[PDB]
Amino acid sequence: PTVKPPTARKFIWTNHKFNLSGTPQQYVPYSTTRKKIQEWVPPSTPYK
Amino acid sequence: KVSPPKRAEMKTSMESLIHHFKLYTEGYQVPPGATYTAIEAPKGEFGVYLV
Amino acid sequence: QLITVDEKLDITTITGVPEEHIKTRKARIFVPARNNMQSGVNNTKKWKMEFDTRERWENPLMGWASTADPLSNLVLTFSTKEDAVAFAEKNGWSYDVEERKVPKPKSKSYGANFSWNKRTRVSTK
Amino acid sequence: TSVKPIFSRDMNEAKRRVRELYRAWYREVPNTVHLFQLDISVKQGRDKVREMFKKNAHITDPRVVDLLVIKGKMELEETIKVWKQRTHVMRFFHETEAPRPKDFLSKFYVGHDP
Amino acid sequence: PSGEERCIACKLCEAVCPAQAITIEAEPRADGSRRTTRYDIDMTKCIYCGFCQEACPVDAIVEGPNFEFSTETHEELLYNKEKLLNNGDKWEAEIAANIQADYLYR
Amino acid sequence: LGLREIRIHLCQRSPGSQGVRDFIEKRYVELKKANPDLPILIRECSDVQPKLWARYAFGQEKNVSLNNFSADQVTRALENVLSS
Amino acid sequence: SNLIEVFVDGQSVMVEPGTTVLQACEKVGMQIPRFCYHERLSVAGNCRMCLVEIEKAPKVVAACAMPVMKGWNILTNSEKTKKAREGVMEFLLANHPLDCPICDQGGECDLQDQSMMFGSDRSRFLEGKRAVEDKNIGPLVKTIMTRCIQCTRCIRFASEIAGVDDLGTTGRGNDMQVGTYIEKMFMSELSGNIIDICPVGALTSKPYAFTARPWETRKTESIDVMDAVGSNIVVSTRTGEVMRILPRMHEDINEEWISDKTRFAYDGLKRQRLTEPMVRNEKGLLTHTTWEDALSRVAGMLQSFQGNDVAAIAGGLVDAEALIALKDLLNRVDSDTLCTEEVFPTAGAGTDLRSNYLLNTTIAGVEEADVVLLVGTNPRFEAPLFNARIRKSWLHNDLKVALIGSPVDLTYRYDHLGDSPKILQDIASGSHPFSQVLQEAKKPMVILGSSALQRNDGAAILAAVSNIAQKIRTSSGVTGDWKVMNILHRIASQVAALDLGYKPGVEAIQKNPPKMLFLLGADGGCITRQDLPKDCFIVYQGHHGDVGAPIADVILPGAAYTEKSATYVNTEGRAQQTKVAVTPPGLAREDWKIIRALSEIAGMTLPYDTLDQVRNRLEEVSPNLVRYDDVEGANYFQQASELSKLVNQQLLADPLVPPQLTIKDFYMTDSISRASQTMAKCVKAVTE
Amino acid sequence: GVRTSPTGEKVTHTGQVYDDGDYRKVRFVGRQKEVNENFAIDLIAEQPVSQVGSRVISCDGGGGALGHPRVYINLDKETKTGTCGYCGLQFRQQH
Amino acid sequence: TRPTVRPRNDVAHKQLSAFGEYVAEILPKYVQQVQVSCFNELEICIHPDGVIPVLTFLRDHSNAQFKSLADLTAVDIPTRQNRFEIVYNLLSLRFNSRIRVKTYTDELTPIESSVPVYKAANWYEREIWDMFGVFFANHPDLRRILTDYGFEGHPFRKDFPLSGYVELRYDDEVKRVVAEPVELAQEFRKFDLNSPWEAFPAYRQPP
Ligand code: SF4
Ligand code: SF4
Ligand code: SF4
Ligand code: SF4
Ligand code: FES
Ligand SMILES: [K+]
Ligand SMILES: [Zn+2]
């Protein structure tokens, strides 16, 4: 890379990170989608 | 209709993009039939009976 | 030498299926309806057997669709309704058969588009 | 209705094969418990054998009975020669599976399965 | 180069994946763009065959040059879209150069 | 413990339902006049055995076969239910 | 007799005269390629993809438009035919955009699939492509018109099926553009069908946009419950979620179309859902609880009440399995106040005779009628696919249509006789000139909408309309087997309710207000707490929190129609069944199982524990309810007319005005459509 | 951009965030929630609209055969800009 | 010689056809159909009673000499009343030729074990029994070969589910591996791939 540096992009990490497994920085999977079914919320007033 | 187009053709030609799309989703159809085909594999005769 | 066996064919005990997936299941024997998004009719030739849909739920870790139904993806193809019904009976599945729906023959006439006195006259082409 | 037999020509001949298989399983249970060092008793093992024979008591097709006996002999051979391991023997007892109540209400509370 | 995602949720990679390792959901983005809301790769299902990157029409999903990412838990190998995008931002300098060297054989 | 509902099932064309078809065509209008508040549900279905169903209080039901019944036998059968 | 012999690749086939070359190939099982041709639209012959060689003819013919001639041999696979398909396909793809990855049609595209089968495998077009601007035609159909291949299917469908002459072509040559020229929305009740018939991704569904690919969806064949037509549908699901609704071909019901409410209201199934049993706490607020706690509270009240103290109202989306289960449960406390929200006059025969409340001519029968008399109804919105069938007969058989009621727009011209209900008496007595038309007709059809029986003089209007139909039949000139009198229903659950013996309307509940009320998905607002004793115990079973749930003492979450296998009887009396596409959400349960579970806890166990057994119960009460897809005939109109004359009623001086006058009233008519955000967009679009 | 819920959990570019009372956020305790900070919807909006002199312009995303399939964009409407459906670059026809 | 098209070898097609009717003439008691595909493979379809006579003749006859059993497999076609098609692929070193012999059976009908003809057939028949449940009469030692001990069912049947009915895990309470009903965190996603447009007119079936 001294002779042929890589093409710069503004979204490329400026700071490389090594393998973070086993540490508090480890990746934890999760679902990236929002809740699919919306539940009816009952009224807050008494009327019955 | 069997082998996918080159990527540069896939990105310029309408027919190539269609065929790339279909080959990588449905895949090519194979005419009905059955074959036993064998080769001289390193361990001996290796064959498939493909229907 | 051939022997006479007069009972109905019932292989439920030698197929290895669990009991809950013989008596609780409902097989549907049908010809798939044409996908309305396309005009081709080649997916309406053969009969199909499918089973009732059971629960799918979200995986707590990833949100994937989990199932406990081993027959959820099982689809069988048959040449005729009779073949599908015979297969269901010998396996012990209760089934619903649905008649094949064939498109009705139509009277098409290009010349009707320009009728002298009828309503079939088109206003544009 | 003229079909090629497997072994038995009729249910009377088939039931004889069943009885011989039952004797072989009945005799073997004490050996299975001792060899595999199971923590069930010979009575439990023999009750289970009886349970497996009972579930097929309604068969009236000699060919189906013949195939059930053939598989029974294969299963017995796997056990006698210790091809099966303790895990395979104990799978008949479903020890780790929780009861699923069969009443309408109990199913109704837990899910949509009939 | 602008920073917009290349993936337009065509699901060709998901369709071709021999292992069914890819899971995708998509919807119109708030600006109307055709973009994914889910893009998971189960790295314990994946067979690292590269069919997904062959199938991708826009060079969105790639197999990069990293092979040193073993983990201490199974769950750490279930990648979601955030992980995969971070991988792209982490490795883009090498990935772009590797694609430059080989795209004329593709 | 009284009567609550009467249901008559029959085929539109089978000869076994001819007497019931006659009874409806002839005597049903007068039956409904006598019991204006009594649901008498006549339900035709192809290739069914004709039957008379009576529902009494608290959901007790009994059915009576009208197969190959004359219009007179049908009248008697209904009379038993309306009475007994 | 007049069949002429032709040959397809040397194989003889006998066809009626007028059969096209395309139709002749169908008879031997060969499907000629096509784009512009649709068998339910007028022949266009502009795409040229159907070109086929006739043996010994130097020029290939358009198979979709050319009638066959005796002795012709059609070479569907000749090199001449193949080279024609490649040429046309190459012209179709010259200017077509490289959009498949971002195009919703990808995977179920006729252009893709026929390019694969009939086109070449590469391109020799070395120019720049055409680009066309897109056009807004409402919130339901997205237009990416650069993908349009100018097949004119949308134009023909809009004119001929939907009866709307807004779509057309502007310009000419390569710059010819499909659209509306001006800015206009295509908001017909049948508008969504142009998504299906458009062969490419030019017209797609906005709600569905980008959400799925065709290969990954599972297809559940089911029945629509948004109306009483009973349209056959396919429910597309993926990974446990409903993705879209498509039509399913049924010649005798919906052909291959569905209404916009059928197509686009499914998104109301993801909102305002009941997912957990609820009871009232100590402050009078609804609180989540278990099925055990919730059913015990209901069972306790059910055990302390009898007779008239207990009633039930079934709503519009209730299935027959739940209907009979709830009837059996109430009958076991000696209650018979089983009511529906949708009124039907009980005078005379009432619901004793099926012919009294059925579309006896059937939907397909409209094609054989020569006069139709529509009374007090707006079939366009009440039953869009039945109205489409009338326009089909109007267009193709020169059917004469007259309407007594408001002068609504039915997408075809009709004779508006006025709106006064008294006009019916004039027709019956011969004073009105239209009485001559009915006598002359060989197959008249009088259709009385259920909307008009919701008035207070409904029995009078039914008696008047029935009187008209009696005079026609009596005076002869109508074949014996032809049925004349019809009722057009708008509620999915109505006919199964009347078949099982439910009382139509809540009039019974108004006379003797109960102490315990079961609201079985009843969200019309017919009964509120103003009409009930102050301490009335109200149990709501349903799938949406809409109108009935907020006033209930107990909420039992049930399954929507996409989530159960349930029986629905359409306006012809034809029974059909849905299938489970996805399971109910949360703690929701199948509806007849809730009632069956309640019966056990209350000690009145119903005698059926499976779906098949409860369907055996349906057979004991009305045997037609298990004859799926069969239209069981109903007779004895003479007896019904006799009993209808006994008690005379006065017609009201109020003109017949249907509930739905314009499109804006069509989109939200039930709990599911009211919860649909897409249906809310449509209402906004047609009122702003 | 990347917001935080009232609980402090970052909201992703897909809008995901566990609501309070969702037990599943326990999976982040002692660890972290992987969130990509470069929101593509924000990045693309930063691009300037390109002015062109023709009614139709083509976009391949840049880089020749390293971009996306080449598409042609109509610029006849002055009520808005033409947007590439693959990459989101905007174009306008000048006068 | 079009570069992308497989060439035709007409000499082989003629040779295999001639030998095809040669076998039909000699064993008419059993042979039901003889065909040669467009890629020159000869198939003999026989009544199952002729498994031993036909295979013995092909192995031993001086004009056949099919000494090697290359492969013995089964195919499940549920729409047939005899759902299982048994396929013998044989090789002749003397004449440098291959031949396929096919027969049929159902769930309850035994097929004669061909071990007396080809010792290779021993394990192939065990596999067919294991994966399809076809019983071979007079097999020296017929038992499962591929599936787990005590496994229930025949996985290669079309109606056996892809993921089976039971799965395994280690249970700490009983200190052993146990079997339980199968639940998948991610259900297999069924894809509907077939295009609704016919691909090969040459194979169209009559309506
Ligand atoms: S490399 Fe992995 S994710 Fe990509 S197609 Fe192959 S198995 Fe699927
Ligand atoms: S990564 Fe590529 S192939 Fe996969 S969905 Fe996105 S654009 Fe399509
Ligand atoms: S209409 Fe068909 S061919 Fe055209 S871009 Fe869409 S999927 Fe591709
Ligand atoms: S929009 Fe679709 S249906 Fe209409 S002319 Fe264009 S391709 Fe045909
Ligand atoms: S299908 Fe005949 S020209 Fe279009
Ligand atoms: K379309
Ligand atoms: Zn671009």
* Of residues G116, D4, G426, the one with CA closest to residue I104: D4
Which tokens in the block code for residue C113?
């588009």
How distant, in Å, are the alpha carbons of G24, G201, I193 from that of G107?
Answer: 29, 11, 8
Give strand ranges (E) for G503-618: 503-504, 516-520, 537-542, 554-557, 567-569, 575-577
Q: C-alpha angle with apex G605: G604 to G609, nearest 5 degrees? A: 165
How distant, in Å, are the alpha carbons of D84, G239, G242, G273, G539 from that of G587?
Answer: 43, 19, 18, 11, 17
User: Helices (DSSP H) in I85-165: which residue ranges?
Assistant: 121-132
D47's CB contacts (< 8 A; 6+ apart) are none
Dist. CA D32–CA D82, nearest whole Å: 9
Under a CB-based contact definition with an 8 Å cutoff, are residues G599 and D105 in contact? Answer: no
Torsion angles phi and psi, residue G673, rounded to 5: -70, -35
I14's CB contacts (< 8 A; 6+ apart) are none
Nearest CA to ligand 4 atom 4: G154
Amino acid at the residue I121: A
I106 burial (CB, 10 Å; 0-12 / 13-18 / 19+) is: middle
Compute the distance from residue F38 Cα to the ligand 4 centre, in Å: 59
Under a CB-based contact definition with an 8 Å cutoff, are residues F69 and F11 in contact? Answer: no
Give strand ranges (E) for chain I: 31-36, 42-46, 68-76, 84-92, 97-105, 111-112, 136-137, 166-171, 176-181
Dist. CA C76–CA C87, nearest whole Å: 10
Dist. CA G574–CA G567, nearest whole Å: 10
Amino acid at the residue I109: T
Cβ atoms within 10 Å of G525's Cβ, excluding its own: 11
Under a CB-based contact definition with an 8 Å cutoff, are residues G397 and G408 in contact? Answer: no
Task: Name the DSSP letter for residue A39.
Answer: B
Dist. CA G318–CA G341, nearest whole Å: 11
Under a CB-based contact definition with an 8 Å cutoff, are residues G493 and G318 in contact? Answer: yes
- Per DSSP, the three-state class of G339 is strand
Binary contact (I191, G216; C-beta < 8 A) = yes
Which tokens in the block code for residue G642?
């006799």
* Closest in D61, D68, D112 to C5, CB measured: D61
* Of residues G191, G201, G362, the one with CA closest to residue G261: G191
Q: C-alpha angle with apex G322: G321 to G324, nearest 5 degrees? A: 70
Compute the distance from residue B24 Cα to the ligand 1 centre, in Å: 13
Residue with tokens 């008649």: C99
Task: Name the DSSP letter for residue G628.
Answer: B
Resolution for this model in angstroms, one decimal place? Answer: 2.3
Residue with tokens 């057994």: G613
A30 membership: H or E segment, kind and range: none
Under a CB-based contact definition with an 8 Å cutoff, are residues F41 and G622 in contact? Answer: yes
Residue with tokens 């088109």: C122
**What does C92-124 look like in DSSP terms, one character per residue?**
T-EEEE-PPP-PPP----GGGGG-SSSTT--S-
E80 burial (CB, 10 Å; 0-12 / 13-18 / 19+) is: buried
Nearest CA to CA, how far is D112 from chain G (Å)?
A: 7
Under a CB-based contact definition with an 8 Å cutoff, are residues C27 and C93 in contact? Answer: yes
How distant, in Å, are the alpha carbons of G209, G366, G560, I159, I165 from that of G247?
Answer: 18, 21, 19, 30, 35
Q: What ligand has the least distance to the C-alpha of G36?
A: 5
- Per DSSP, the three-state class of F15 is helix
- Per DSSP, the three-state class of G531 is helix
* Of residues G428, G447, G448, the one with CA closest to residue G438: G428
**What does C24-76 look like in DSSP terms, one character per residue?**
S-EEEEEPPPPPTT----GGGSSEEEEE----EEE-TTT--EEE--TTTT--E
Under a CB-based contact definition with an 8 Å cutoff, are residues G105 and G200 in contact? Answer: yes
**C-alpha radius of gyration, chain B, whole number:** 16
* Of residues G490, G403, G383, G406, the one with CA closest to residue G445: G403
Beta bridge partners of G661: none
Give chain B's length: 51
- Per DSSP, the three-state class of F56 is strand
I13 membership: H or E segment, kind and range: helix I10-26
Compute the distance from residue E12 Cα to the ligand 2 centre, in Å: 6
Cβ atoms within 10 Å of G256's Cβ, excluding its own: 21
F72 membership: H or E segment, kind and range: helix F71-83
Closest residue of chain E to B24, computed from CA coordinates: E16
Domain count, chain F: 1
Atom of ligand 2 nearest to the CA of E12: 3
Residue with tokens 């008498």: F40
Give chain A's length: 48
Torsion angles phi and psi, residue G400, rounded to 5: -100, 125
For ligand 3, say whether the CB of G99 is within 6 Å of any of its atoms: yes
Max Cα separation, chain C?
78
G615's CB contacts (< 8 A; 6+ apart) are G321, G567, G625, G626
Cβ atoms within 10 Å of C26's Cβ, excluding its own: 18
Domain extent for F75: 3-83
Q: Is E89 annotated as a binding residue?
A: no
H25 membership: H or E segment, kind and range: none
For ligand 3, say whether the CB of G145 is within 6 Å of any of its atoms: no
Cβ atoms within 10 Å of H24's Cβ, excluding its own: 13
Atom of ligand 2 nearest to the CA of E14: 4
CATH number of the domain encompassing residue F33? 3.40.30.10
* Of residues H80, H2, H67, the one with CA closest to residue H34: H2
- Per DSSP, the three-state class of G684 is helix
Substitution target from I162, I169, I184, I189 for chain E, most E beta carbons within 10 A: I189
The domain ranges of chain D are 1-114
I2's CB contacts (< 8 A; 6+ apart) are none
Question: Breaks in chain G, named by the residue before each, with C–N above 2.5 Å?
Answer: none
Max Cα separation, chain I?
70
A15's CB contacts (< 8 A; 6+ apart) are none
User: Helices (DSSP H) in H2-95: which residue ranges?
Assistant: 40-45
F73's CB contacts (< 8 A; 6+ apart) are F19, F66
I87 membership: H or E segment, kind and range: strand I84-92
Which tokens in the block code for residue G107?
């995977």
For ligand 1, say whether the CB of E51 is within 6 Å of any of its atoms: yes
Give chain G's length: 688
* Of residues G170, G328, G287, the one with CA closest to residue G555: G287
| Helical axes G110-118 vs G79-94, angle rounded to 10° | 140
Atom of ligand 3 nearest to the CA of B17: 8
Beta bridge partners of G222: G233
